[PDB]
Amino acid sequence: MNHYDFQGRSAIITGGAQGFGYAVAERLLQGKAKVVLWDMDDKALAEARAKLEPLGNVETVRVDISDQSDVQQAIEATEKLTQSIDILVHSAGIAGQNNPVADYSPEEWRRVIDIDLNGAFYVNQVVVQRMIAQNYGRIVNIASIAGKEGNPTASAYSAAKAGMIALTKSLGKETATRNIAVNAITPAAAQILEQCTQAHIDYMLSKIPRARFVKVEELAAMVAWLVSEENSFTTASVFDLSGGRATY
Numbered sequence: 001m002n003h004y005d006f007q008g009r010s011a012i013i014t015g016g017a018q019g020f021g022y023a024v025a026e027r028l029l030q031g032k033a034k035v036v037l038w039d040m041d042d043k044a045l046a047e048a049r050a051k052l053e054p055l056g057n058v059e060t061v062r063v064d065i066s067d068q069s070d071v072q073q074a075i076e077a078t079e080k081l082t083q084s085i086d087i088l089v090h091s092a093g094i095a096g097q098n099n100p101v102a103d104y105s106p107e108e109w110r111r112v113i114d115i116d117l118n119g120a121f122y123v124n125q126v127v128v129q130r131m132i133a134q135n136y137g138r139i140v141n142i143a144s145i146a147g148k149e150g151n152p153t154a155s156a157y158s159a160a161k162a163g164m165i166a167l168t169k170s171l172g173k174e175t176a177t178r179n180i181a182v183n184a185i186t187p188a189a190a191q192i193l194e195q196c197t198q199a200h201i202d203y204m205l206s207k208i209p210r211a212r213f214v215k216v217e218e219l220a221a222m223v224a225w226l227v228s229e230e231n232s233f234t235t236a237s238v239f240d241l242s243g244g245r246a247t248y
């Protein structure tokens with residue numbers, strides 16, 4: 001096992017109460033970062049803080065990242081809890097319902113874009129402002145393989161994740177002359193997936209050459225390096241976690 005140092009650094013992790021964000025918070029606490037969990041569910045946040053407290057110092061902020069005003073209230077509350085805001089791992093988002101474009105609900109389309117794309121912009125804006133003021137920052141926007149490939153019957157989700165990738169490329173080059181790294185990750189499906197049929201699971205696994213889904217352990221390990229100081233050159237890039245499926 002590697003060790004990523006985070007002493008003196010503070011991190012914001014949206015969607016940190018469970019799943020990918022929780023696994024990243026668990027690893028950043030091993031690097032002894034100060035972790036602030038952003039999530040919409042106040043109940044899940046309370047269970048996360050209870051599990052993670054024996055691992056280190058953790059704070060929680062209730063916020064809907066698709067509401068820009070709630071994001072503005074969240075970043076100010078976080079400033080009262082930290083000395084600086086050094087790391088952002090944007091993991092909040094929904095999967096959206098599955099439907100062909102010909103049948104997709106306009107309301108569901110707008111809901112997916114607001115949460116998975118507009119929300120990512122709101123969070124990235126207020127956090128990078130602090131990173132600019134301190135001339136330090138590391139950002140990882142957790143996208144998806146769907147953003148690269150355009151999965152059939154998931155157009156809204158795929159379109160939202162592709163915007164997050166372009167947002168990442170744009171924001172990265174805007175801050176390239178500063179000590180700020182802005183990158184994204186395109187993971188495959190994770191072990192959310194239990195609502196699927198077995199035949200549907202066999203189809204998803206047939207597109208992944210490793211024949212298995214990514215473990216939250218493996219995502220958190222790669223995120224931990226991407227938000228460390230040693231990631232001092234690569235920015236506006238996409239790091240893959242698809243197990244051999246992606247071709248670019």
Ligand SMILES: NC(=O)c1ccc[n+]([C@@H]2O[C@H](COP(=O)([O-])OP(=O)(O)OC[C@H]3O[C@@H](n4cnc5c(N)ncnc54)[C@H](O)[C@@H]3O)[C@@H](O)[C@H]2O)c1
Nearest residue numbers: 015018019020039040064065066091092093144188189190
């Ligand atoms: N798990 C997968 O198979 C998979 C695959 C590819 C990409 N992703 C992406 O990774 C992210 C989440 O992954 P996960 O496995 O941890 O899902 P999850 O359901 O286990 O957790 C998602 C968390 O984000 C929160 N959330 C949703 N909308 C929110 C909002 N407006 N404001 C604040 N919090 C909100 C949720 O409360 C939850 O805590 C998403 O961006 C997802 O698109 C997941």
